[PDB]
C-alpha cells in the first residue's frame, strides 16, 4: 500500500498527470486495458529475470548493432586486408592503452583475449566486457566487431575505435534488481450479427452546448471503413440551431450482417450554397468486446481542423471529446431484444469455405454475370503479368474499379505474389460479408512480407483487425531492434488509428519497450511529447502507466530527465513572456541566477541526455551556456561529460533547447535523410549526410544535437565568391586538401538530391553549415513537401567554386561532371525505394503536422521522384529542374 502510493507518485510525475485520474474513469474499456495489459508487463519482466544478471544487463545496455553483419565493398576497402586497428584501454590505480590489429569480424571475447595477450607480453577472458570510451555503451553480446554501430562509424569516418576494458562485476553491481509488483487494480439472448435480417438505422435525438454567433444546421452522417464509405451519406432535416433537436431516424443503404468489423459512424454538425462543418465526431459501430452498439449514447464533438474543406472527418480519431464543455450530440441506436455480437472466426471460416465451394462450382455463364467472378482454368499468362505489374505500383497510384474487380477475381493467384496484398485489400468489397469472410481466410494463411511492406498495412487505409494483426505478426517475426528503433516514430503514430486500446500493435510495442531500454526510452518520450494532445492523451497516458510500472529502475532515471526538461520549459517560458524585450546581457544574468538556485541546479545536472541516454550529462558549464538571438530564442546548453575517458569522445556535451517551434517536421526529415544515406552507402555511393539528433519532448518544445566544429556559410563569408573555397583550403592544407573537396562535393550532392525530393524550406547562408573537414550539411528542416516543384538548395557560385577547385569556369569542368553523376545516381537510387518513403509519410498523416494533412500532400514526392515517368524521363526531369533553378548548367 505505502510502496504502491510512492510508485504512483513517481509514475504520475513521469506522465505529467496523477494515476488516480485513471481510477476515476468509468469506461470499462479503460479499466480492462489497465488490467489486461499487465500480462505484457509480466512477460517482459520474466525475460529480464531469465538469464540473470546478463539478461538484465542486455535490457539496460542492449547491443547497438546494425541489422546486417555483412559490409559494403567501398567500406571494406578502407580496412587493411579485412582488418581494423583498435585501441583497448585498461584503467589501473592511470590509463594504459593497448593498440590491437585484428580482423573486422572478431567477437568481443577474442578482442578481450588479444588485449590480455598484449598486457601479458609487456611483463580471464570471460570475466571482462568491452565498453565504448566516453559513453555508456557496451558490447555485451557476441556479434562481429564491425556490426556494432560505433565500430562501423569509425571505419566509415576514418577514426580510431577506443574501447575500455571493464570487469563484469563492476557493471552488474551498478544495475539494481528491479521488483515488479502487480498493482491493486489488477484484482435477452446473445445473437450473432449475421442472423439479423434488418437494414441499418441510427436515431439522432438532439445536440447541447451548441454555442454559435449561422442560420440553420443539420447532422451529416456516414458509414465508413477507414476512409472508404460503405454506403451513401445521410443528412437530417435542417433546423435553426436556436433549437438543436431532430429525433429523426436516418436510414442507410447497408444490410446489418454486411457491416464489417471495423465499421464506424462518422458524423458532423454542419451549417449552410456554402456548407461548412462546425463540429465533428466518430464512433465505432462495434465495441472492444465485439458487441454492436445499442441504446442511447452521448458523443462530445471536436473542433474542425484548419484547412479541411470536407464536411465529415472519417480519418479523425474515434470516440468522445474529453472536454465536456463542447457540442454534445445525443444518439440512439437500434435495439433487437438481445446482445448483438460480431460472429467469431469459426463461423467466419465456415461461411468463407461455403462461398469458395459454391464459386468453384459456377458455370461459365454464372461467372459471366460479374467481373468480380472468374473461373480457375481461364487464368492466362498475360493476366499473371498484369497482376505482377499492378503490385510494383506505388501506394498513391490509383487502382481503377476495373483493376479492383480483376484483383479480387484472381485473389487466389495473388497468394503467389504476396507483396500485392495492400492492393488486393483495397479491392475488397468491405460492405459484403461474403467477400470479407474470404479475405480473412486468405489473410490468415497469407505468406510473410517484409517489415517495410507490412508497415503500410498499419496506416489509416487498413482499419481491419485481421489485416493489422497480420502486419504485426510480420513485424514480430522479421523486424530487428535496429529497424524498430529507426521506425519507432511511425509505429507510435499508427497506434492512433487503432479502434481500441487493447490491440496486437500496442502489445508488440510495449513488450519491445520493456525488453529493450533503448527502444523503451524513445517509446516513453514519443508518447510523453503528445500528452498535451487530447485526441490521444488517454490512450498514451494509459500506455505510459503500463510502461512505467514495468520498466524497472529506469523510471527514476526518466524522472530526472522529466524534471530537468520541466525546469527548462519554466525558465524559457518566463524569458518568452516576462523578459522578452530585455538585452542578451540582462537575460543571461536572470538565467544564471535562476539556474544557480539549489533546487534548479540539482535538477539541471547529473542526468541522461534524452537525445541519447548513453550520454551522461554531468555538471552544467554555465559560462559556456548562451541564449541565442534567433527565432524563439533557444538555449545553447553545455554539460561536462563525467565519463572517465571523456577526452576520447567529447569532454563537453552541447545541446540546443528550443521552446516555441514544432520540431516533429525536423524529426521526420532527419529520419528520412538517415534512411536515404543508408540506401546510398549500401549501393556503393558514399554521400555523407549529417542527420543531427532532434527530439520533440512536448508541445512545440524539444532538444537538438549541436554539431561540433561547424560554421554557417554566413560565418565563413563575413569572416566575394572565393571566400568559402579559401576557408576550406586554409582549413585543409597540404595532402588533406583533396579529401576535403571530395567530402564537400559528396555531401553537397546528397543534400541537393534529398532536399529536392522532400521539398524542404528554402536554403540560404544561415541554414546551411559546413564542418572544418569539408562536410556540408543543412539545419532547420521546418517545412517539407508542397508547402510546379521547387529547388530548395540552389548551388550559388560559392559552392561550385569549391567543387571545381578554385577554377573560374566551374560549370564546365570534369569535377562538376562527376558531381552531377553523383546526383543522378543518388536521385535514381531513392526512386527505387519510393514506396518506403511514401509509406513513412503515410504513417505520419494522423499527427497534427500542418504540412502533412492528406494523401495529396504526400503526392508531392510522386512528382519530385517522377514515378509515372520512365527512369530516363526521370533523369531528364531532374536535370530540367536543376537547369532552370541555376539558369543554365544542367
Ligand atoms: C549563429 C549560429 N551559431 C551556431 C549555429 C549552430 C552550430 C551548430 N549546430 N548544430 C546543430 C545546429 C542547429 C540544428 C537545428 C536548428 C538550429 C541549429 C536552429 C537554427 C536554432 C539555432 C539558431 C541559432 C543558434 C543555435 C541554434 C533551429 O531552429 N534548428 C547548429 N547550429 C548556427 N548559427
Curated annotation (Swiss-Prot):
Task: Give the InterPro entries listed for this entry.
Answer: ARM-type_fold (IPR016024), C2_domain_sf (IPR035892), Kinase-like_dom_sf (IPR011009), PI3/4_kinase_cat_dom (IPR000403), PI3/4_kinase_cat_sf (IPR036940), PI3/4_kinase_CS (IPR018936), PI3K-type_C2_dom (IPR002420), PI3K_ABD (IPR003113)
Q: What is the effect of changing residue 402 to E?
A: In BC; uncertain significance
Q: Which SMART domains match?
A: PI3K_C2, PI3K_p85B, PI3K_rbd, PI3Ka, PI3Kc
Q: What class of enzyme is it?
A: transferase
Where the record annotates domain PIK helical, the positions are: 373-550
Give GO terms: molecular function aspect only. 1-phosphatidylinositol-3-kinase activity; 1-phosphatidylinositol-4,5-bisphosphate 3-kinase activity; 1-phosphatidylinositol-4-phosphate 3-kinase activity; ATP binding; insulin receptor substrate binding; protein kinase activator activity; protein serine kinase activity; protein serine/threonine kinase activity
> Annotated pathway, please?
Phospholipid metabolism; phosphatidylinositol phosphate biosynthesis
User: What Gene Ontology cellular component terms go with this record?
Assistant: cytoplasm; cytosol; intercalated disc; lamellipodium; perinuclear region of cytoplasm; phosphatidylinositol 3-kinase complex; phosphatidylinositol 3-kinase complex, class IA; phosphatidylinositol 3-kinase complex, class IB
Q: Which CDD domains match?
A: C2_PI3K_class_I_alpha, PI3Ka_I, PI3Kc_IA_alpha
**Impact when changing residue 886 to Y:** In MCAP; also found in an endometrial carcinoma sample
Record domain C2 PI3K-type: where? 196-343
Region described as Activation loop: 778-796
Alphabetized Pfam families for the sequence = PI3_PI4_kinase, PI3K_C2, PI3K_p85B, PI3K_rbd, PI3Ka
Q: Any idea of its EC number?
A: 2.7.1.137, 2.7.1.153, 2.7.11.1
Q: Which PANTHER family match?
A: PHOSPHATIDYLINOSITOL 4,5-BISPHOSPHATE 3-KINASE CATALYTIC SUBUNIT ALPHA ISOFORM (PTHR10048:SF107), PHOSPHATIDYLINOSITOL KINASE (PTHR10048)
* Protein family: Belongs to the PI3/PI4-kinase family.
Task of the protein:
Phosphoinositide-3-kinase (PI3K) phosphorylates phosphatidylinositol (PI) and its phosphorylated derivatives at position 3 of the inositol ring to produce 3-phosphoinositides. Uses ATP and PtdIns(4,5)P2 (phosphatidylinositol 4,5-bisphosphate) to generate phosphatidylinositol 3,4,5-trisphosphate (PIP3). PIP3 plays a key role by recruiting PH domain-containing proteins to the membrane, including AKT1 and PDPK1, activating signaling cascades involved in cell growth, survival, proliferation, motility and morphology. Participates in cellular signaling in response to various growth factors.
Q: Cite any additional comment in the entry.
A: The avian sarcoma virus 16 genome encodes an oncogene derived from PIK3CA.
Q: What free text does the record give on domains? A: The PI3K-ABD domain and the PI3K-RBD domain interact with the PI3K/PI4K kinase domain. The C2 PI3K-type domain may facilitate the recruitment to the plasma membrane. The inhibitory interactions with PIK3R1 are mediated by the PI3K-ABD domain and the C2 PI3K-type domain with the iSH2 (inter-SH2) region of PIK3R1, and the C2 PI3K-type domain, the PI3K helical domain, and the PI3K/PI4K kinase domain with the nSH2 (N-terminal SH2) region of PIK3R1.
Q: What is this protein called?
A: Phosphatidylinositol 4,5-bisphosphate 3-kinase catalytic subunit alpha isoform
Which organism is the protein's source?
Answer: Homo sapiens (Human)
Amino acid at each position: 500500500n505505502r510502496e504502491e502510493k510512492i510508485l504512483n507518485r513517481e509514475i504520475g510525475f513521469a506522465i505529467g498527470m496523477p494515476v488516480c485520474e485513471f481510477d476515476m474513469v468509468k469506461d470499462p474499456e479503460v479499466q480492462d486495458f489497465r488490467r489486461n495489459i499487465l500480462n505484457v508487463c509480466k512477460e517482459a519482466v520474466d525475460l529480464r529475470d531469465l538469464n540473470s544478471p546478463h539478461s538484465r544487463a542486455m535490457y539496460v545496455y542492449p547491443p547497438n548493432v546494425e541489422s546486417s553483419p555483412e559490409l559494403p565493398k567501398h567500406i571494406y576497402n578502407k580496412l587493411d586486408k579485412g582488418q581494423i586497428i583498435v585501441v583497448i584501454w585498461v584503467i589501473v590505480s592511470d590509463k594504459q592503452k593497448y593498440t590491437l590489429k585484428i580482423n573486422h569480424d572478431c567477437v568481443p571475447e577474442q578482442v578481450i583475449a588479444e588485449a590480455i595477450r598484449k598486457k601479458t607480453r609487456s611483463m580471464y577472458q570471460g570475466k571482462y566486457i568491452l565498453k565504448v570510451c566516453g559513453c555508456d555503451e557496451y558490447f555485451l553480446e557476441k556479434y562481429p566487431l564491425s556490426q556494432y554501430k560505433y565500430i562501423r562509424s569509425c571505419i566509415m569516418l576514418g577514426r580510431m575505435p577506443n574501447l575500455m576494458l571493464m570487469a563484469k562485476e563492476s557493471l552488474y553491481s551498478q544495475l539494481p534488481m528491479d521488483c515488479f509488483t502487480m498493482p491493486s487494480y489488477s484484482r435477452t439472448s446473445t445473437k450473432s450479427l449475421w442472423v439479423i435480417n434488418s437494414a441499418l438505422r441510427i436515431k439522432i435525438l438532439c445536440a447541447t452546448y451548441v454555442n454559435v454567433n449561422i442560420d440553420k444546421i443539420y447532422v451529416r452522417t456516414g458509414i465508413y471503413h477507414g476512409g472508404e464509405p460503405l454506403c451513401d451519406n445521410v443528412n437530417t432535416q435542417r433546423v435553426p440551431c436556436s433549437n438543436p433537436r431532430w429525433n429523426e431516424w436516418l436510414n442507410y443503404d447497408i444490410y446489418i450482417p454486411d457491416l464489417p468489423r471495423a465499421a464506424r459512424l462518422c458524423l458532423s454538425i454542419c451549417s449552410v450554397e456554402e456548407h461548412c462543418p462546425l463540429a465533428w465526431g466518430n464512433i465505432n459501430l462495434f465495441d472492444y468486446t465485439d458487441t454492436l452498439v445499442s441504446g442511447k449514447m452521448a458523443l462530445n464533438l471536436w473542433p474542425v481542423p484548419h484547412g479541411l474543406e470536407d464536411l465529415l472527418n472519417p480519418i479523425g480519431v474515434t470516440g468522445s471529446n474529453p472536454n465536456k464543455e463542447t457540442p454534445c450530440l445525443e444518439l440512439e441506436f437500434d435495439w433487437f431484444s438481445s446482445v448483438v455480437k460480431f460472429p467469431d472466426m469459426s463461423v467466419i471460416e465456415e461461411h468463407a469455405n461455403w462461398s469458395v465451394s459454391r464459386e468453384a462450382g459456377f458455370s461459365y455463364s454464372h461467372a459471366g454475370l460479374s467481373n468480380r467472378l472468374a473461373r480457375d482454368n481461364e487464368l492466362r499468362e498475360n493476366d499473371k503479368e498484369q497482376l505482377k505489374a499492378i503490385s510494383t505500383r506505388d501506394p498513391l497510384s490509383e487502382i481503377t474499379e476495373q483493376e479492383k474487380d480483376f484483383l479480387w477475381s484472381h485473389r487466389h493467384y495473388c497468394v503467389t505474389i504476396p507483396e500485392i496484398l495492400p492492393k488486393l485489400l483495397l479491392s475488397v468489397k468491405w460492405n459484403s460479408r461474403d467477400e470479407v469472410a474470404q479475405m480473412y481466410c486468405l489473410v490468415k494463411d497469407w505468406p510473410p512480407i517484409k517489415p517495410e511492406q507490412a508497415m503500410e498495412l498499419l496506416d489509416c487505409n487498413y482499419p481491419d483487425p485481421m489485416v493489422r494483426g497480420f502486419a504485426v505478426r510480420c513485424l514480430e517475426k522479421y523486424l530487428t531492434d535496429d529497424k524498430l528503433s529507426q521506425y519507432l516514430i511511425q509505429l507510435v503514430q499508427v497506434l492512433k488509428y487503432e479502434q481500441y486500446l487493447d490491440n496486437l500493435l500496442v502489445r508488440f510495442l510495449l513488450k519491445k519497450a520493456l525488453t529493450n531500454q533503448r527502444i523503451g526510452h524513445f517509446f516513453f518520450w514519443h508518447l510523453k511529447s503528445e500528452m498535451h494532445n487530447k485526441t490521444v492523451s488517454q490512450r498514451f497516458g494509459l500506455l505510459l502507466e503500463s510502461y512505467c510500472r514495468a520498466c524497472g529502475m529506469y523510471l527514476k532515471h526518466l524522472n530526472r530527465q522529466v524534471e530537468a526538461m520541466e525546469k527548462l520549459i519554466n525558465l524559457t517560458d518566463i524569458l518568452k513572456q516576462e523578459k522578452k524585450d530585455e538585452t542578451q546581457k540582462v537575460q543571461m544574468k536572470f538565467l544564471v541566477e535562476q539556474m544557480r538556485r539549489p533546487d534548479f541546479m540539482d535538477a539541471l545536472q547529473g542526468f541522461l541526455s534524452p537525445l541519447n541516454p548513453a550520454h551522461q550529462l554531468g555538471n552544467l558549464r554555465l559560462e559556456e551556456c548562451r541564449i541565442m538571438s534567433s527565432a524563439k530564442r533557444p538555449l545553447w546548453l553545455n554539460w561536462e561529460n563525467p565519463d572517465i575517458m571523456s577526452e576520447l569522445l567529447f569532454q563537453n556535451n552541447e545541446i540546443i533547447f528550443k521552446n516555441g517551434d514544432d520540431l516533429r517536421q525536423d524529426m521526420l526529415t532527419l529520419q528520412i535523410i538517415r534512411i536515404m544515406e543508408n540506401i546510398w552507402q549500401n549501393q556503393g555511393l558514399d554521400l555523407r549526410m549529417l542527420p543531427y539528433g532532434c527530439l520533440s519532448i512536448g508541445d512545440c518544445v524539444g532538444l537538438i544535437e549541436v554539431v561540433r566544429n561547424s560554421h554557417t556559410i554566413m560565418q565563413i563569408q563575413c569572416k566575394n565568391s572565393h571566400t568559402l573555397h579559401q576557408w576550406l583550403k586554409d582549413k585543409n592544407k597540404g595532402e588533406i586538401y583533396d579529401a576535403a573537396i571530395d567530402l564537400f562535393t559528396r555531401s553537397c550532392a546528397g543534400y541537393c538530391v534529398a532536399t529536392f525530393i522532400l521539398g524542404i524550406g528554402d536554403r540560404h547562408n544561415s541554414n546551411i553549415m559546413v564542418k572544418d573537414d569539408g562536410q556540408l550539411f543543412h539545419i532547420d528542416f521546418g517545412h517539407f513537401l508542397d508547402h510546379r516543384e521547387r529547388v530548395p538548395f540552389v548551388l550559388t557560385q560559392d559552392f561550385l567554386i569549391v567543387i571545381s577547385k578554385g577554377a573560374q569556369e566551374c560549370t564546365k569542368t570534369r569535377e562538376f561532371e562527376r558531381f552531377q553523376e553523383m546526383c543522378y545516381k543518388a536521385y535514381l537510387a531513392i526512386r527505387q525505394h519510393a514506396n518506403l518513403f511514401i509509406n513513412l509519410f503515410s504513417m505520419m498523416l494522423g499527427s497534427g503536422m500542418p504540412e502533412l494533412q492528406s494523401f495529396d500532400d504526400i503526392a508531392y514526392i510522386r512528382k519530385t521522384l517522377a514515378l509515372d515517368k520512365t527512369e530516363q524521363e526521370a533523369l531528364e526531369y531532374f536535370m530540367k529542374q536543376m537547369n532552370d533553378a541555376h539558369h543554365g548548367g544542367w
